[PDB]
Amino acid sequence: QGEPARVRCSHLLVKHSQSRRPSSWRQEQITRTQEEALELINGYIQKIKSGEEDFESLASQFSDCSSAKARGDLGAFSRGQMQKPFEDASFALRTGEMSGPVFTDSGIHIILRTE
């Protein structure tokens, strides 16, 4: 009750060979396994938690989503606009919180709720 109509999120996507589209601006063919993507995701999370790296800086360098060009920013979205697992994870975050690994048809994500 009272939920905001929209949230704004940045994310870092690591695709794998069973992503809906196993290709990105980084690689014409993404051949890593889902487990390898999860290992990379957990490595990125650790780098962010330790303060060695900034979330948006990692997303701009390493996210397999075209939103890497926007430093991970997807913009604001309402319910029904993102894939259900991503939507649910996003709306479950408090503003400024970062998720753990989120599994979608696109790959594995880290999500940072920015608004």
mmCIF file with all atom_site columns, C-alpha atoms in Angstrom:
data_model
loop_
_atom_site.group_PDB
_atom_site.id
_atom_site.type_symbol
_atom_site.label_atom_id
_atom_site.label_alt_id
_atom_site.label_comp_id
_atom_site.label_asym_id
_atom_site.label_entity_id
_atom_site.label_seq_id
_atom_site.pdbx_PDB_ins_code
_atom_site.Cartn_x
_atom_site.Cartn_y
_atom_site.Cartn_z
_atom_site.occupancy
_atom_site.B_iso_or_equiv
_atom_site.pdbx_formal_charge
_atom_site.auth_seq_id
_atom_site.auth_comp_id
_atom_site.auth_asym_id
_atom_site.auth_atom_id
_atom_site.pdbx_PDB_model_num
ATOM 1   C CA . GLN A 1 1   ? 0.000  0.000   0.000   1.00 0.00 ? 1   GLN A CA 1
ATOM 2   C CA . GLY A 1 2   ? 1.300  3.441   -0.990  1.00 0.00 ? 2   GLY A CA 1
ATOM 3   C CA . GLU A 1 3   ? 4.183  2.055   -3.045  1.00 0.00 ? 3   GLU A CA 1
ATOM 4   C CA . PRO A 1 4   ? 5.736  4.634   -5.390  1.00 0.00 ? 4   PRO A CA 1
ATOM 5   C CA . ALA A 1 5   ? 4.473  4.423   -8.943  1.00 0.00 ? 5   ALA A CA 1
ATOM 6   C CA . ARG A 1 6   ? 8.058  4.245   -10.191 1.00 0.00 ? 6   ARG A CA 1
ATOM 7   C CA . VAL A 1 7   ? 11.532 3.403   -8.990  1.00 0.00 ? 7   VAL A CA 1
ATOM 8   C CA . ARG A 1 8   ? 14.820 4.255   -10.658 1.00 0.00 ? 8   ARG A CA 1
ATOM 9   C CA . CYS A 1 9   ? 17.592 1.696   -10.817 1.00 0.00 ? 9   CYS A CA 1
ATOM 10  C CA . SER A 1 10  ? 21.055 1.158   -12.136 1.00 0.00 ? 10  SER A CA 1
ATOM 11  C CA . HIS A 1 11  ? 22.241 -2.367  -12.745 1.00 0.00 ? 11  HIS A CA 1
ATOM 12  C CA . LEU A 1 12  ? 25.174 -4.467  -13.857 1.00 0.00 ? 12  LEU A CA 1
ATOM 13  C CA . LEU A 1 13  ? 24.199 -7.407  -16.072 1.00 0.00 ? 13  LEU A CA 1
ATOM 14  C CA . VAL A 1 14  ? 26.413 -10.421 -16.670 1.00 0.00 ? 14  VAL A CA 1
ATOM 15  C CA . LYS A 1 15  ? 25.001 -12.552 -19.452 1.00 0.00 ? 15  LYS A CA 1
ATOM 16  C CA . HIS A 1 16  ? 25.698 -16.228 -20.006 1.00 0.00 ? 16  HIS A CA 1
ATOM 17  C CA . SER A 1 17  ? 25.238 -18.823 -22.702 1.00 0.00 ? 17  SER A CA 1
ATOM 18  C CA . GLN A 1 18  ? 21.590 -19.358 -21.677 1.00 0.00 ? 18  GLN A CA 1
ATOM 19  C CA . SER A 1 19  ? 20.650 -15.669 -21.727 1.00 0.00 ? 19  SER A CA 1
ATOM 20  C CA . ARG A 1 20  ? 17.776 -14.804 -24.059 1.00 0.00 ? 20  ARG A CA 1
ATOM 21  C CA . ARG A 1 21  ? 20.291 -12.956 -26.262 1.00 0.00 ? 21  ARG A CA 1
ATOM 22  C CA . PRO A 1 22  ? 23.826 -14.293 -25.574 1.00 0.00 ? 22  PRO A CA 1
ATOM 23  C CA . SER A 1 23  ? 25.503 -11.292 -27.181 1.00 0.00 ? 23  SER A CA 1
ATOM 24  C CA . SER A 1 24  ? 26.384 -7.799  -26.003 1.00 0.00 ? 24  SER A CA 1
ATOM 25  C CA . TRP A 1 25  ? 28.444 -4.746  -26.882 1.00 0.00 ? 25  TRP A CA 1
ATOM 26  C CA . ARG A 1 26  ? 31.311 -6.611  -25.167 1.00 0.00 ? 26  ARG A CA 1
ATOM 27  C CA . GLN A 1 27  ? 31.060 -9.919  -27.050 1.00 0.00 ? 27  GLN A CA 1
ATOM 28  C CA . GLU A 1 28  ? 29.290 -11.012 -30.214 1.00 0.00 ? 28  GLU A CA 1
ATOM 29  C CA . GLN A 1 29  ? 28.921 -14.446 -28.609 1.00 0.00 ? 29  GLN A CA 1
ATOM 30  C CA . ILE A 1 30  ? 28.699 -14.825 -24.844 1.00 0.00 ? 30  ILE A CA 1
ATOM 31  C CA . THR A 1 31  ? 29.964 -18.317 -24.017 1.00 0.00 ? 31  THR A CA 1
ATOM 32  C CA . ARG A 1 32  ? 30.412 -18.196 -20.234 1.00 0.00 ? 32  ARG A CA 1
ATOM 33  C CA . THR A 1 33  ? 28.174 -20.474 -18.224 1.00 0.00 ? 33  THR A CA 1
ATOM 34  C CA . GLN A 1 34  ? 25.571 -19.245 -15.806 1.00 0.00 ? 34  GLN A CA 1
ATOM 35  C CA . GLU A 1 35  ? 27.821 -20.388 -12.956 1.00 0.00 ? 35  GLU A CA 1
ATOM 36  C CA . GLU A 1 36  ? 30.721 -18.390 -14.396 1.00 0.00 ? 36  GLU A CA 1
ATOM 37  C CA . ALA A 1 37  ? 28.460 -15.344 -14.667 1.00 0.00 ? 37  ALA A CA 1
ATOM 38  C CA . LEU A 1 38  ? 27.499 -15.800 -11.015 1.00 0.00 ? 38  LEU A CA 1
ATOM 39  C CA . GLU A 1 39  ? 31.167 -15.971 -10.015 1.00 0.00 ? 39  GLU A CA 1
ATOM 40  C CA . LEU A 1 40  ? 31.798 -12.709 -11.877 1.00 0.00 ? 40  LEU A CA 1
ATOM 41  C CA . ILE A 1 41  ? 28.742 -11.069 -10.286 1.00 0.00 ? 41  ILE A CA 1
ATOM 42  C CA . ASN A 1 42  ? 29.912 -12.082 -6.809  1.00 0.00 ? 42  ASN A CA 1
ATOM 43  C CA . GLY A 1 43  ? 33.344 -10.700 -7.606  1.00 0.00 ? 43  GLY A CA 1
ATOM 44  C CA . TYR A 1 44  ? 31.804 -7.383  -8.644  1.00 0.00 ? 44  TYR A CA 1
ATOM 45  C CA . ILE A 1 45  ? 29.691 -7.292  -5.469  1.00 0.00 ? 45  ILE A CA 1
ATOM 46  C CA . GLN A 1 46  ? 32.769 -7.857  -3.312  1.00 0.00 ? 46  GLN A CA 1
ATOM 47  C CA . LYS A 1 47  ? 34.634 -5.069  -5.109  1.00 0.00 ? 47  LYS A CA 1
ATOM 48  C CA . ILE A 1 48  ? 31.709 -2.714  -4.454  1.00 0.00 ? 48  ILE A CA 1
ATOM 49  C CA . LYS A 1 49  ? 31.261 -3.736  -0.813  1.00 0.00 ? 49  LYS A CA 1
ATOM 50  C CA . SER A 1 50  ? 34.961 -3.247  -0.052  1.00 0.00 ? 50  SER A CA 1
ATOM 51  C CA . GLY A 1 51  ? 34.887 0.203   -1.667  1.00 0.00 ? 51  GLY A CA 1
ATOM 52  C CA . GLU A 1 52  ? 37.613 -0.737  -4.148  1.00 0.00 ? 52  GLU A CA 1
ATOM 53  C CA . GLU A 1 53  ? 35.262 0.083   -7.051  1.00 0.00 ? 53  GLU A CA 1
ATOM 54  C CA . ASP A 1 54  ? 32.184 2.241   -7.659  1.00 0.00 ? 54  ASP A CA 1
ATOM 55  C CA . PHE A 1 55  ? 28.973 0.526   -8.780  1.00 0.00 ? 55  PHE A CA 1
ATOM 56  C CA . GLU A 1 56  ? 28.393 2.779   -11.782 1.00 0.00 ? 56  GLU A CA 1
ATOM 57  C CA . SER A 1 57  ? 32.042 2.585   -12.809 1.00 0.00 ? 57  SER A CA 1
ATOM 58  C CA . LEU A 1 58  ? 31.893 -1.215  -12.873 1.00 0.00 ? 58  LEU A CA 1
ATOM 59  C CA . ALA A 1 59  ? 28.596 -1.170  -14.752 1.00 0.00 ? 59  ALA A CA 1
ATOM 60  C CA . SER A 1 60  ? 29.980 1.184   -17.392 1.00 0.00 ? 60  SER A CA 1
ATOM 61  C CA . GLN A 1 61  ? 32.983 -1.140  -17.956 1.00 0.00 ? 61  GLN A CA 1
ATOM 62  C CA . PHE A 1 62  ? 31.583 -4.622  -17.464 1.00 0.00 ? 62  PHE A CA 1
ATOM 63  C CA . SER A 1 63  ? 27.789 -4.722  -17.795 1.00 0.00 ? 63  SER A CA 1
ATOM 64  C CA . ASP A 1 64  ? 26.548 -6.745  -20.785 1.00 0.00 ? 64  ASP A CA 1
ATOM 65  C CA . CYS A 1 65  ? 23.508 -4.451  -20.979 1.00 0.00 ? 65  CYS A CA 1
ATOM 66  C CA . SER A 1 66  ? 23.502 -1.513  -23.390 1.00 0.00 ? 66  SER A CA 1
ATOM 67  C CA . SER A 1 67  ? 22.697 0.579   -20.304 1.00 0.00 ? 67  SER A CA 1
ATOM 68  C CA . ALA A 1 68  ? 26.441 0.330   -19.637 1.00 0.00 ? 68  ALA A CA 1
ATOM 69  C CA . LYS A 1 69  ? 26.584 3.417   -21.866 1.00 0.00 ? 69  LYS A CA 1
ATOM 70  C CA . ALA A 1 70  ? 24.481 5.204   -19.223 1.00 0.00 ? 70  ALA A CA 1
ATOM 71  C CA . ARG A 1 71  ? 26.722 3.889   -16.433 1.00 0.00 ? 71  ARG A CA 1
ATOM 72  C CA . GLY A 1 72  ? 24.090 1.261   -15.655 1.00 0.00 ? 72  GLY A CA 1
ATOM 73  C CA . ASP A 1 73  ? 21.126 3.618   -15.391 1.00 0.00 ? 73  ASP A CA 1
ATOM 74  C CA . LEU A 1 74  ? 17.895 2.106   -16.718 1.00 0.00 ? 74  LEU A CA 1
ATOM 75  C CA . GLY A 1 75  ? 15.818 5.167   -15.890 1.00 0.00 ? 75  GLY A CA 1
ATOM 76  C CA . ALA A 1 76  ? 12.644 5.182   -13.888 1.00 0.00 ? 76  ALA A CA 1
ATOM 77  C CA . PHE A 1 77  ? 10.133 2.409   -14.357 1.00 0.00 ? 77  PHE A CA 1
ATOM 78  C CA . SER A 1 78  ? 6.762  1.320   -13.067 1.00 0.00 ? 78  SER A CA 1
ATOM 79  C CA . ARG A 1 79  ? 5.470  -2.134  -12.360 1.00 0.00 ? 79  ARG A CA 1
ATOM 80  C CA . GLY A 1 80  ? 4.816  -4.125  -15.516 1.00 0.00 ? 80  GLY A CA 1
ATOM 81  C CA . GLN A 1 81  ? 7.720  -2.581  -17.425 1.00 0.00 ? 81  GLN A CA 1
ATOM 82  C CA . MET A 1 82  ? 10.675 -4.777  -16.424 1.00 0.00 ? 82  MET A CA 1
ATOM 83  C CA . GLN A 1 83  ? 10.870 -8.562  -16.280 1.00 0.00 ? 83  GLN A CA 1
ATOM 84  C CA . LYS A 1 84  ? 9.139  -9.814  -13.153 1.00 0.00 ? 84  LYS A CA 1
ATOM 85  C CA . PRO A 1 85  ? 12.253 -11.006 -11.249 1.00 0.00 ? 85  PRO A CA 1
ATOM 86  C CA . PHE A 1 86  ? 14.028 -7.713  -11.899 1.00 0.00 ? 86  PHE A CA 1
ATOM 87  C CA . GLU A 1 87  ? 10.955 -5.657  -11.058 1.00 0.00 ? 87  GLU A CA 1
ATOM 88  C CA . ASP A 1 88  ? 10.381 -7.485  -7.793  1.00 0.00 ? 88  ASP A CA 1
ATOM 89  C CA . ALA A 1 89  ? 13.996 -7.141  -6.718  1.00 0.00 ? 89  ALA A CA 1
ATOM 90  C CA . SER A 1 90  ? 14.017 -3.446  -7.630  1.00 0.00 ? 90  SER A CA 1
ATOM 91  C CA . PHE A 1 91  ? 10.847 -2.522  -5.770  1.00 0.00 ? 91  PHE A CA 1
ATOM 92  C CA . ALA A 1 92  ? 12.032 -4.554  -2.752  1.00 0.00 ? 92  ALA A CA 1
ATOM 93  C CA . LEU A 1 93  ? 15.101 -2.340  -2.394  1.00 0.00 ? 93  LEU A CA 1
ATOM 94  C CA . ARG A 1 94  ? 15.064 0.749   -0.255  1.00 0.00 ? 94  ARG A CA 1
ATOM 95  C CA . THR A 1 95  ? 16.446 3.823   -1.952  1.00 0.00 ? 95  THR A CA 1
ATOM 96  C CA . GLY A 1 96  ? 20.224 3.535   -2.177  1.00 0.00 ? 96  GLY A CA 1
ATOM 97  C CA . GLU A 1 97  ? 20.275 -0.203  -1.472  1.00 0.00 ? 97  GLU A CA 1
ATOM 98  C CA . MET A 1 98  ? 22.092 -2.712  -3.653  1.00 0.00 ? 98  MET A CA 1
ATOM 99  C CA . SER A 1 99  ? 20.741 -6.187  -4.351  1.00 0.00 ? 99  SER A CA 1
ATOM 100 C CA . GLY A 1 100 ? 22.487 -9.497  -4.333  1.00 0.00 ? 100 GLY A CA 1
ATOM 101 C CA . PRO A 1 101 ? 22.447 -11.588 -7.516  1.00 0.00 ? 101 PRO A CA 1
ATOM 102 C CA . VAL A 1 102 ? 19.148 -11.332 -9.410  1.00 0.00 ? 102 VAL A CA 1
ATOM 103 C CA . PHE A 1 103 ? 18.434 -14.044 -11.999 1.00 0.00 ? 103 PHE A CA 1
ATOM 104 C CA . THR A 1 104 ? 16.422 -13.166 -15.087 1.00 0.00 ? 104 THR A CA 1
ATOM 105 C CA . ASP A 1 105 ? 15.917 -14.367 -18.627 1.00 0.00 ? 105 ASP A CA 1
ATOM 106 C CA . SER A 1 106 ? 18.568 -11.792 -19.598 1.00 0.00 ? 106 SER A CA 1
ATOM 107 C CA . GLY A 1 107 ? 21.305 -13.009 -17.252 1.00 0.00 ? 107 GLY A CA 1
ATOM 108 C CA . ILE A 1 108 ? 22.405 -12.231 -13.699 1.00 0.00 ? 108 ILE A CA 1
ATOM 109 C CA . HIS A 1 109 ? 22.141 -8.686  -12.364 1.00 0.00 ? 109 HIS A CA 1
ATOM 110 C CA . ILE A 1 110 ? 23.259 -6.518  -9.529  1.00 0.00 ? 110 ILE A CA 1
ATOM 111 C CA . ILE A 1 111 ? 20.704 -3.759  -8.955  1.00 0.00 ? 111 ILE A CA 1
ATOM 112 C CA . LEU A 1 112 ? 21.239 -0.406  -7.251  1.00 0.00 ? 112 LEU A CA 1
ATOM 113 C CA . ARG A 1 113 ? 18.025 1.468   -6.482  1.00 0.00 ? 113 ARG A CA 1
ATOM 114 C CA . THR A 1 114 ? 18.758 5.155   -7.014  1.00 0.00 ? 114 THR A CA 1
ATOM 115 C CA . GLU A 1 115 ? 15.279 6.646   -6.491  1.00 0.00 ? 115 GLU A CA 1
#
